[PDB]
Amino acid sequence: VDERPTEQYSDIGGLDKQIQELVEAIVLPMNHKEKFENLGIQPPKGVLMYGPPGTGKTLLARACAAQTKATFLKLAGPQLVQMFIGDG
Amino acid sequence: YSATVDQRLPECAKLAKEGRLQEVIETLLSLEKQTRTASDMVSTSRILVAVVKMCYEAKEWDLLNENIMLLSKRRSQLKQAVAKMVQQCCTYVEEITDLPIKLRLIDTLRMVTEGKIYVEIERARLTKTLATIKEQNGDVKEAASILQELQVETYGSMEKKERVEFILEQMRLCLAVKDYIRTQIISKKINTKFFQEENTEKLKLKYYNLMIQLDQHEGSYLSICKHYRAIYDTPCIQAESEKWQQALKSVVLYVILAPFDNEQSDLVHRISGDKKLEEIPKYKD
Amino acid sequence: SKMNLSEEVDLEDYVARPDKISGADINSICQESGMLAVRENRYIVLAKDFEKAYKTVIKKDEQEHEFYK
Amino acid sequence: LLEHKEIDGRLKELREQLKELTKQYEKSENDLKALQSVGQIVGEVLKQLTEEKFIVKATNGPRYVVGCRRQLDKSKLKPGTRVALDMTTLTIMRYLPREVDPLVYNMSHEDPGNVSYSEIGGLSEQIRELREVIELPLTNPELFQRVGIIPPKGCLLYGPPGTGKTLLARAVASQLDCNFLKVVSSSIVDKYIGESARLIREMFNYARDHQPCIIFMDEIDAIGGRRFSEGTSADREIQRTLMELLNQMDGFDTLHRVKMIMATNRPDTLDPALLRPGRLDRKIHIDLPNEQARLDILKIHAGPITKHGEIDYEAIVKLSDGFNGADLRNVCTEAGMFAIRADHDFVVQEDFMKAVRKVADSKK
């Protein structure tokens, strides 16, 4: 469980719209959860992200954990396909 | 449409004060038809209350009969519109004191009302008016039949409460029938609507008197014993000293004649030390 | 037997209907008739709610394309 | 009032503020009585040799013949009853509740969230039917008994996914205020050969131990998916689990007050034996919401969202055909999501309309 993934958004490049969407997807509702409760609605709870197999979703997740300075958990689909019962 | 009808309300009212049924019925039919097609909110209510008001003030029952059977036979009618029509006929049939007109009008309100609607409580009001009419006419078995056809268990519009107590009106006119089984069945199935009728009211006396007279004809005494003790207990019976002493005489002469078991032993050694029977020492003795 | 009276219901005719129903289905039918009686708030079932229960239990709705038949 | 300013100037702190040391003394006395205790062995009673001598097997240890404490309900010490043993004299000190499987524990202590009955929308006839078939034996059993029928064992709710079977069962459980066993049939199958049926056994043993209980087994087609003799190992163990479920629900040991709810999306593939009555007495069709049902769902899920000025439902109903339940809830939620895209503290009609648009596109 790494805590410091060491990204400043200067490591990830070319996903500027994607990274702004990242920020407003997780950290922006996190700091302004009070403005979410003012609306009387619950914040978004997860993000669906897709791309080619070598498109760097992992590093973007690290960068997100970096600027949000939060702890970082991680699960892998190809890790979860085997290991039979227990993945859950 | 609403503009046509709202500038027509003066025009159609000044036309209505002439009677002249045919043409106004035709135009109101056309406008009500277009508003049923278009699903309008207030113009439909105004136009149907208008036609019903015009028939009632113009003093024809065949014409309002035709209005009812047309927009019952006619389709795409707003249910609130039919409800307002029948409730207006109700408030246009309970105040009139014409026996043939009243009976014909309740016949029409009976045969229109397949497909009961949220206003079926207000229709229960008119069926209790019909209950008064069958009380004054002599019909007894058909009386209970008719006021039970407007049933209460299919009636789901708001909790029964005391409001639709015509379960107890059924037990009452059916005590006139003397068929206690119906009353026991409704009492058993009142489970959906709380086991006991709403406390701190005046129908307590009515229901418990139906119960005591029903038991009197039965010949059972023990449940009636408990019931008359309960009649004693209530503070409502403790308003005037007379009423207490009369009802207490009744309670005691109801309680002496019972056989013996253990639950009545519980009752009697719970009630033996009661302090409000000493004003009448004969029955205490 | 433990059921309340049927009020002159053709139990023998319901029996006589040719239908491949097991004793579990008979117990169902009777139970469902009781449920319908409770819902309609009448303690003595008769042909109406009994018939609705009978139709309800053995639905066996074919829903089958007719080219099979 | 000479030396009676407030209270002697001192008793205010001495009487209660400095009497917190008596609360600490109470804590010390609890430590005392905890100290005099010695702890106890645990075990399961195996047999009643006589009125006094009991064969008791300690867990992961040897078995003994032991006596019982003088004041105890011997009529309660059935075989298999988990019990406590004094560590030194080895006598029955106190009975214990039967050990619950960790999976059954987890499946049991999930809070239903006290969901009310209003928050369903447009299921009126079916929810009335389910209310009857589950609630009524749990509210007035005497009604069923006097009628002359046996209270129903349970029923099935079949329909397309997202149609509220889970929510409806949860509402029944919350309204009953009883023990609820929320289960999904895909989660009990195990690679180990005999563990799935064993988990079913533990589930129903807990249910019988914690009456009144509601067994909600979602996705039942993953267990009761018809019996065939092809012979593959996995589906054959599925047959075995189905047989165990049938036994536990309408087998030799009758069920009293457990009332089990089962939901699925493929009612047709269920095994006829499971589909036979006695086990599942009613089949409820929780079908896709109708137009009136759709508007009901819309309005019931539009409560918490703050509306400004005008929000109508018939437009969303007519232009949101084919939806179901959670999709309409998604419409409301992502309308709220839209509300911060243009930074409102409220919602507008066009917001709702574009929300149902995007939800419909996601539906395509």
Ligand SMILES: Nc1ncnc2c1ncn2[C@@H]1O[C@H](COP(=O)(O)OP(=O)(O)O)[C@@H](O)[C@H]1O
């Ligand atoms: N724009 C980018 N910046 C940095 N690394 C990238 C970028 N695009 C792709 N990558 C690389 O792609 C890999 C991520 O693969 P990923 O899509 O996470 O695999 P999977 O889909 O199996 O999770 C990383 O090793 C990362 O170095």
Ligand SMILES: Nc1ncnc2c1ncn2[C@@H]1O[C@H](COP(=O)(O)OP(=O)(O)O)[C@@H](O)[C@H]1O
């Ligand atoms: N009347 C309704 N019908 C269907 N779903 C509803 C209804 N009311 C609310 N829901 C939504 O259903 C979701 C729960 O999934 P649900 O549809 O109950 O399970 P299932 O997929 O088994 O039907 C809740 O998030 C809730 O928002």
